[PDB]
Amino acid sequence: MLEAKFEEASLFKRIIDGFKDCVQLVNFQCKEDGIIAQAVDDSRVLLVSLEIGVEAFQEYRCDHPVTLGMDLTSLSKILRCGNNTDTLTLIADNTPDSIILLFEDTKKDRIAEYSLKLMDIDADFLKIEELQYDSTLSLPSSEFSKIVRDLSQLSDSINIMITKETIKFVADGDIGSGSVIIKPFVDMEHPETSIKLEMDQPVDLTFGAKYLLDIIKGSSLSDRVGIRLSSEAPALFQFDLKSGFLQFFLAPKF
Amino acid sequence: MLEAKFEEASLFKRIIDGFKDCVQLVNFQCKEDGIIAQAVDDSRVLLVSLEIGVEAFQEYRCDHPVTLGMDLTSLSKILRCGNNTDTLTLIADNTPDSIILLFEDTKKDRIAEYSLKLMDIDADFLKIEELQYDSTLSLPSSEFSKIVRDLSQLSDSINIMITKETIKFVADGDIGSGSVIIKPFVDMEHPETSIKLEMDQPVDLTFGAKYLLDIIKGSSLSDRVGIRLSSEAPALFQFDLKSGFLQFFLAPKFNDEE
Amino acid sequence: MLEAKFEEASLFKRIIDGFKDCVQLVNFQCKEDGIIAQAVDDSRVLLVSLEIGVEAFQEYRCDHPVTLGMDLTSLSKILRCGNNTDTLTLIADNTPDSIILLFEDTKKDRIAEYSLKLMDIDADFLKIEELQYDSTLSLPSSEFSKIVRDLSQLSDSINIMITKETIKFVADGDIGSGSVIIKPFVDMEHPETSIKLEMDQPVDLTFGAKYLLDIIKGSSLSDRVGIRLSSEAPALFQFDLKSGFLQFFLAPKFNDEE
Amino acid sequence: NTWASSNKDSPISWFKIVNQLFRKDPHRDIKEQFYELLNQVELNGNSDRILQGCFNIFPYVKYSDNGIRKPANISDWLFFHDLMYQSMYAHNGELLRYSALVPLVFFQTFGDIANKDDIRMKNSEYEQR
Amino acid sequence: TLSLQLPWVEKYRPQVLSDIVGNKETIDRLQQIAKDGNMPHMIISGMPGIGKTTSVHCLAHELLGRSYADGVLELNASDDRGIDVVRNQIKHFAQKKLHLPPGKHKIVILDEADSMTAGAQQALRRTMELYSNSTRFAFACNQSNKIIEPLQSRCAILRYSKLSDEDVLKRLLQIIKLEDVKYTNDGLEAIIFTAEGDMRQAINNLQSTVAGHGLVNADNVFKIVDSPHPLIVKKMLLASNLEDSIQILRTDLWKKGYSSIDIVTTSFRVTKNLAQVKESVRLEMIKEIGLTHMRILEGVGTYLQLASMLAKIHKLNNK
DNA sequence: AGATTCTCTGTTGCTGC
DNA sequence: AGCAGCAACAGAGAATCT
Numbered sequence A: 001m002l003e004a005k006f007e008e009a010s011l012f013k014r015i016i017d018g019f020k021d022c023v024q025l026v027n028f029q030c031k032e033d034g035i036i037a038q039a040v041d042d043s044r045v046l047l048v049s050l051e052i053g054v055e056a057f058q059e060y061r062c063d064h065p066v067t068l069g070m071d072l073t074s075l076s077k078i079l080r081c082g083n084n085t086d087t088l089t090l091i092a093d094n095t096p097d098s099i100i101l102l103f104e105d106t107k108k109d110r111i112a113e114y115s116l117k118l119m120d121i122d123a124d125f126l127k128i129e130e131l132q133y134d135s136t137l138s139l140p141s142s143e144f145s146k147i148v149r150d151l152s153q154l155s156d157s158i159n160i161m162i163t164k165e166t167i168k169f170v171a172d173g174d175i176g177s178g179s180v181i182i183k184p185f186v187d188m189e190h191p192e193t194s195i196k197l198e199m200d201q202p203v204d205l206t207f208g209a210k211y212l213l214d215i216i217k218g219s220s221l222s223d224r225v226g227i228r229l230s231s232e233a234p235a236l237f238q239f240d241l242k243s244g245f246l247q248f249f250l251a252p253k254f
Numbered sequence B, C: 001m002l003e004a005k006f007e008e009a010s011l012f013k014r015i016i017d018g019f020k021d022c023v024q025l026v027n028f029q030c031k032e033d034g035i036i037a038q039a040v041d042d043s044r045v046l047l048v049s050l051e052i053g054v055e056a057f058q059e060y061r062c063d064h065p066v067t068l069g070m071d072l073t074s075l076s077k078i079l080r081c082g083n084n085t086d087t088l089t090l091i092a093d094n095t096p097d098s099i100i101l102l103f104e105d106t107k108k109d110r111i112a113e114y115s116l117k118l119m120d121i122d123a124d125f126l127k128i129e130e131l132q133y134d135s136t137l138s139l140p141s142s143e144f145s146k147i148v149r150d151l152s153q154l155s156d157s158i159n160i161m162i163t164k165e166t167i168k169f170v171a172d173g174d175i176g177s178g179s180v181i182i183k184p185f186v187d188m189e190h191p192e193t194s195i196k197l198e199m200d201q202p203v204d205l206t207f208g209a210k211y212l213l214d215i216i217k218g219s220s221l222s223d224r225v226g227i228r229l230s231s232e233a234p235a236l237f238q239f240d241l242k243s244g245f246l247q248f249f250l251a252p253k254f255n256d257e258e
Numbered sequence D: 001n002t003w004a005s006s007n008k009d010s011p012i013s014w015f016k017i018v019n020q021l022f023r024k025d026p027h028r029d030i031k032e033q034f035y036e037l038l039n040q041v042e043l044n045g046n047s048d049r050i051l052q053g054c055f056n057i058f059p060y061v062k063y064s065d066n067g068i069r070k071p072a073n074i075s076d077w078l079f080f081h082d083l084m085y086q087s088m089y090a091h092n093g094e095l096l097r098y099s100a101l102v103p104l105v106f107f108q109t110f111g112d113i114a115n116k117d118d119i120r121m122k123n124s125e126y127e128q129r
Numbered sequence E: 001t002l003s004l005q006l007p008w009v010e011k012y013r014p015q016v017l018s019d020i021v022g023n024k025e026t027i028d029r030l031q032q033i034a035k036d037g038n039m040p041h042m043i044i045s046g047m048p049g050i051g052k053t054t055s056v057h058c059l060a061h062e063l064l065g066r067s068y069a070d071g072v073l074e075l076n077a078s079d080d081r082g083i084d085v086v087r088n089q090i091k092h093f094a095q096k097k098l099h100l101p102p103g104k105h106k107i108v109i110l111d112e113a114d115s116m117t118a119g120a121q122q123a124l125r126r127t128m129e130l131y132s133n134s135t136r137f138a139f140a141c142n143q144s145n146k147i148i149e150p151l152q153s154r155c156a157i158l159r160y161s162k163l164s165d166e167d168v169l170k171r172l173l174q175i176i177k178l179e180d181v182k183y184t185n186d187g188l189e190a191i192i193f194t195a196e197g198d199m200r201q202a203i204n205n206l207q208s209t210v211a212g213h214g215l216v217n218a219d220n221v222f223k224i225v226d227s228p229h230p231l232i233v234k235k236m237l238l239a240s241n242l243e244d245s246i247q248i249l250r251t252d253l254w255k256k257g258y259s260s261i262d263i264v265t266t267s268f269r270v271t272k273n274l275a276q277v278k279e280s281v282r283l284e285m286i287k288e289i290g291l292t293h294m295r296i297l298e299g300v301g302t303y304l305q306l307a308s309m310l311a312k313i314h315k316l317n318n319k
Numbered sequence F: 001a002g003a004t005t006c007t008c009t010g011t012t013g014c015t016g017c
Numbered sequence G: 001a002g003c004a005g006c007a008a009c010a011g012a013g014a015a016t017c018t
Ligand SMILES: Nc1ncnc2c1ncn2[C@@H]1O[C@H](COP(=O)(O)OP(=O)(O)OP(O)(O)=S)[C@@H](O)[C@H]1O
Pocket: E008, E009, E010, E012, E013, E014, E019, E020, E021, E022, E047, E048, E049, E050, E051, E052, E053, E054, E055, E141, E142, E171, E199, E200, E203
């Protein structure tokens, strides 16, 4: 059965904010070691993959895995009742037709409970993550958001190019061209602002700006973002959670 | 004549915000003991009724009642000049073709004055309030707004059910069902957050969510909201003012009736 | 060549915010004593004229004037990368096909660089400013914005009337009429709130509210606004910069002329 | 006199097509004239207005008359057009291809060499509606 | 399988104006234009698959040389081509500064110009008029009537025609020589017959027959690419006896899976475009083909309705 | 913490097929 | 006498600045 209680409804709301808009259907699966969820957009260029370990919850009980699919729009519509500080418990039996969201305030006072209708989705979780990527980099997610928001205005394509000690984002369209160049650096005054880069091979990939814009939402879940690029596979943008992570795999433009 | 000066234009602006959208025409009447106003929506399921006593004003003079009708939209269009802190004076002669709104800053400086065209409406104020209602309850208005905003997403109908020591709001539609259950409680740490309930008879009524959404606007006028329900009449949602109140009477859905 | 470095990208962003919306094409020209820019709207009732002296920059080098025209919309689209605190350098060769905007953070870290395509515009800068205007007045720009925002709701025309020691803004339309009357006054408690007026001749001009609304944007560049009116020419609304100014010349309505 | 650029890029005013539908040239093959008129009616896309034009013009046109039957045969076509036009709002517009044929029945039935003058026309139907 | 090969329509897509076997007059015109320069605004109209997009692509490439990337603006029907795009992007490209040779100009290629809205087409007039000295417009459409007359007045009009048998035969022979394919005269004849002046369709059918059987023979072409649909319908309508037309409709069309809607609609086209019989009998046959269509659109589409339509057509032809 | 401005989304109206 | 595709305008929500 499904029985997962989040300390703050806010965490779940931000996680769902990440799937929001860019995907319509999400397939969740709870099990002994936590909850995972996957959603693929219609064009199949973006995969949103979530993992929340048992420790991210205030209470988690699972003696029998349950897989459940649902319309994200329906889910987010209901995901603004958490008061953020409310407690949220996800509940479902072993053969569910619905998923119950239970928001409660500390005191017995107010109890908002929802029963969301589920969709039947053929279980087919993808495992496209690579052992090694050509290049790996992490930087503050707010910085990544700005970089994406800058360039987006210029083109529907933003190119990411990596060479030794150099990361360069570029957009070129009708009104002109733009570029943002960043360099690796360790800031001891607070390392959450550092920019790391490990390059095994220079990379140069192009992505659709509309998708990178969907991806930047993860900033609200983590201070830093990890970006893993390869010429052999979809790029991975990852936002770590306490016991978990939200991952976005994006196929480069051919 | 009409001569009513509000200390802060803000109070009048929030009051009108309450009539806003849900009604088009409002009938005001000033008299010796204050100002009243009534507005009924086209489908006649909602009545908005206002009462402002003489003491709510900084200056009020009335030696001859005046009744005046006007388009709500026209009034709100003009009701964003108050700077909130501006002083507002409503002025009209005994046989008006217009209503004058006069906003002035403390110093003689900016004087914004408006002359709003009036509409002729057959004077017919309703007096549908009941002596006793089946059940009566009050709770923080922000809480009531959240309750309404939650459920609204699920259905066009929100049911309110009352049993001894239990108030339950429920919505059930396409995507599923939802409910908010609250219990009476006295909070001494600050009683403006308490939830009172006096039940003479269990009640169970359904209202059109679109209307409850119009009603929640009153939160901006009062910390608490009083809800009086009866199986014999429209429900009353009331927002108290200093010397006055804004009331919303809403007819329960028969099965399909807002 | 063009080589102008702004200490804070924010100043340039606010300046461009002023041309924004009301004009489509802007003609810039850098030279030995600074940068000027002019833009005229399609109906030719509004001219936006800028002047930034050499001292407004952290670094400015010019051994050869360059004139360049561009689409305002394209420029603003790119003008939200300044982080406000970023440093901004405008760069262009003597015969440019583009204008380079270079934003850099203090540290070598992040460098956002843009290459904006230019438009060819027949160089024809206007010099319509008058020696003397009938009346001249200055007042806080936030106050002027409020005055414009008030009246705008009432009509598409706002009249400015000046008589000895009196400035009066008036709008009159469908829902009624409004007016804002201000009087000259020196506030020593802080003279940036004073209202000065020098009248050589009473004036009474009407302007299209849509244009005055475009003009009020200059508040973000200066605490005060100077307004110069004449019955012989377009009115001048001016917002001073440290070494420079942003000017808006607006033609009075003939009876129907913005 | 400006019309060269019009012949170069502009089609045939539906009024000009209506007056051409009542004209027969004695020096050209009737089949070639019919295919030229079909292409002009199809290119205009406004078969309804052309037909309404034909309906207003046919009583004033000179046509060798035996017993005014020609008008009886054309009432059946016009009725066929009205059924087709009603069906265009109910069904996906595959039937639109047959709409160009009804105006050409006027050329077959009422086309005469006598009709050298352009008859001007109006819109009694909009006023009646 | 891991990857595919490029089709012969794309692989052997002409890149020089000499390789085009289309209309010789317009081809030499565009060749001389690319040789001398000063390319004017143009609108190329015609039918699908005759060398319209390839022609303008070759012209732009030969005229711009290496500056094709930064001097040519391609906009197809797959991209937004509304009033906003014409207002912002096309105007920014036309106003863009670019150092070009003293005989070249920036080219704006607009594929499928017959699909642009009226507002965009109206806004394009002054857009192409004020920048006609540094920006040129080339439209490629199938129906020139869909483009407004003001736009057609500012440009040349090139009407491309169908490709004769000789040109398509020569192009197919060149492709076979370049690909070393086993063929025969009757096979190429059947290919050209099933192409109907469509060079792209001809090359596609040739490549499909090659990859499906290896030998380009009339038997293979007919077994893979069924005979033209309109020709069997024409032979059915032009039948002299009712039983022959009924047998043709039964065996060739109904027993092979052709839907009744396709049969009646193909039937309408054949008749409209018929020239063997007179005008009045053609109009009567079109009238009868119409009632059958109305009955089939109402869901009464069966073989009996088509049989009755043929019977009524024969009764009309029965004097 | 509050107010103002900008951006995005939804709804309505108009035009074209 | 659908739809659709549209495009434009208005309203609401979120973010930034004072
Ligand atoms: N004259 C020609 N010579 C050689 N190949 C040709 C010729 N015309 C067409 N083709 C082939 O057909 C392919 C497509 O031609 P297109 O020019 O795209 O057709 P089209 O005439 O533009 O009609 P559309 O695009 O359907 S409106 C080319 O890539 C060639 O392989």
